[PDB]
Ligand binder design. Structure first.
Ligand SMILES: Cc1cc2nc3c(=O)[nH]c(=O)nc-3n(C[C@H](O)[C@H](O)[C@H](O)COP(=O)(O)O)c2cc1C
Length: 441
């Protein structure tokens, strides 16, 4: 209370430590609001692509949310409007609950990697091996195991980390054990880091030695032939890449198991309707029975032709994207919306098709990135914890920065999802629309 984290050797019982306070108030609001929306997007999403990976992401989202709600207490201590009672107790609990959560996410990242490893190495075996029962067992085990590797903090085995250095009591009253540090390294950091390292090494080496012929389907609806030209343009672009393309007219296809077999599905539709958004006549039946196509888990993307003079430029691309999202499709890229003549927009269509080919690996890239940013944000804390448990270097400012740089990973996951996952961005947009509906009613 007399000290200050970035206080630079000065002691004054007066200071409110505003710089540290605002940095913490800012990180509390960003960790809560960011993960609240991730959780609400899941709540509104009817079906998912990558059900198990999404379940570990939702667990990480709750873990990160609980960090922010848990970060109200040290923020309350910095404002000290009401500091409650028993600061040392308050501090111990806070340091623990924020140590178990950084581990819950540590294991969810280890499990998502194993999940993707299994989906690649044993693809036929995967669906019997990774089951809802084993997944629920696995997540309950991550919450139980996390509480146990940090439980000796309450049974005089020493302090488990600097998550409590914020409160004055843990800076003076608490001291870390190199035995406790060595035990939690061999039970959390070393095993979870090894798992992630091992799995990603294998999965990325497999993505090299694939040589697997990629089969893509295009289904277009055109009443004047523009989406058909755009489809044909897209097809030639994918064929040039190496794809086995089947471009079919929507009026010639039956909905039943239509997407089955294909690694990529592009859906084209022009927009129609006199004072309405209506789908192209040939697509209307395909859209109404899109359920039967096998859209779940499917890497899909949309494109269409429209006229910008219309209130909803390519409103069909919007309707199709919304249903595909709701059937558990992975929308790998924001839809291509062609204004007037597509023959004039060939460079756009080629560019979009080029990008959609690089958008397939996007789901693996985000998981690897979510993990890569996690380890480089908690690596400083574990190497500072590694040393200061052995007492090699002891700094309150380095403790604050490493601690809150690790506490900062909690708001990073939602910004990676928001600026990389096209299905997520779409779920986020529709969530906003529902908030304005509650606002009206
Ligand atoms: C009745 C009517 C409604 C239309 N509504 C829209 C619209 O809401 N949004 C849009 O972008 N284009 C709209 N258009 C323009 C068509 O989407 C455009 O002509 C398109 O290039 C047709 O492509 P197709 O050849 O693949 O049918 C409309 C055209 C008609 C005749």
């Amino acid at each position: 209370r007399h000290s200050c984290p970035l206080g630079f050797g000065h002691y004054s019982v007066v200071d409110v430590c505003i710089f540290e306070t605002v940095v913490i108030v800012l990180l509390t609001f960003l960790i809560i609001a960011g993960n609240l929306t991730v959780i609400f997007v899941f709540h509104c999403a009817p079906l998912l692509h990558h059900y198990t990976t999404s379940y570990f992401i939702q667990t990480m989202a709750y873990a990160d949310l609980f960090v922010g709600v848990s970060c109200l207490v040290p923020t309350l201590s910095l404002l000290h409007y009401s500091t409650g009672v028993h600061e040392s107790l308050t501090c111990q609990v806070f340091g623990y609950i924020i140590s178990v959560l950084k581990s819950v996410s540590m294991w969810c990242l280890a499990c998502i990697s194993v999940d993707r490893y299994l989906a690649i190495t044993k693809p036929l075996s995967y669906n019997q091996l990774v089951t809802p029962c084993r997944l629920r067992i696995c997540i309950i085990l991550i919450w139980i195991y996390s509480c146990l590797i940090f439980l000796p903090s309450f049974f005089g085995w020493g302090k488990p980390g600097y998550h409590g250095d914020i409160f004055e009591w843990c800076a003076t009253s608490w001291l870390t054990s190199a035995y406790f540090t060595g035990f939690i390294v061999c039970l959390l950091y070393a095993p979870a880091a090894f798992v992630v390292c091992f799995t990603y090494f294998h999965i990325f080496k497999i993505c090299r030695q694939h040589t697997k012929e990629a089969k893509a389907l295009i289904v277009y609806g055109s009443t004047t032939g523009n989406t058909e030209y755009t489809a044909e343009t897209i097809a030639r672009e994918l064929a040039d890449a190496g794809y086995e393309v089947d471009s079919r007219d929507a009026a010639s296809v039956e909905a039943g198991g239509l997407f089955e077999g294909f690694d990529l599905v592009l859906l084209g539709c022009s927009t129609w309707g006199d004072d309405s958004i209506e789908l192209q006549d040939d697509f209307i039946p395909l859209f109404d029975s899109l359920e039967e196509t096998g859209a779940q888990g499917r890497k899909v993307a949309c494109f269409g032709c429209g006229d910008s003079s219309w209130e909803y430029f390519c409103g069909a691309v919007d309707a199709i994207e919304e249903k595909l999202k709701n059937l558990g499709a992975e929308i790998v890229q924001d839809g291509l919306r062609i204004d007037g003549d597509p023959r004039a927009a060939r460079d756009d269509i080629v560019g979009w098709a080029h990008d959609v080919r690089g958008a397939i690996r996007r789901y693996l890239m985000v998981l690897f990135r979510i993990t890569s940013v996690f380890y480089m944000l908690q690596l400083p804390y574990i190497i500072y914890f590694l040393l200061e448990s052995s007492r090699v270097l002891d700094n309150p400012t380095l403790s604050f920065l490493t601690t809150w740089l690790a506490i900062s990973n909690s708001f990073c996951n939602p910004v990676i999802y928001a600026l990389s996952d096209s299905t997520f961005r779409l779920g986020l947009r529709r969530l906003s629309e529902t908030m304005c509906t509650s606002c009206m009613c």
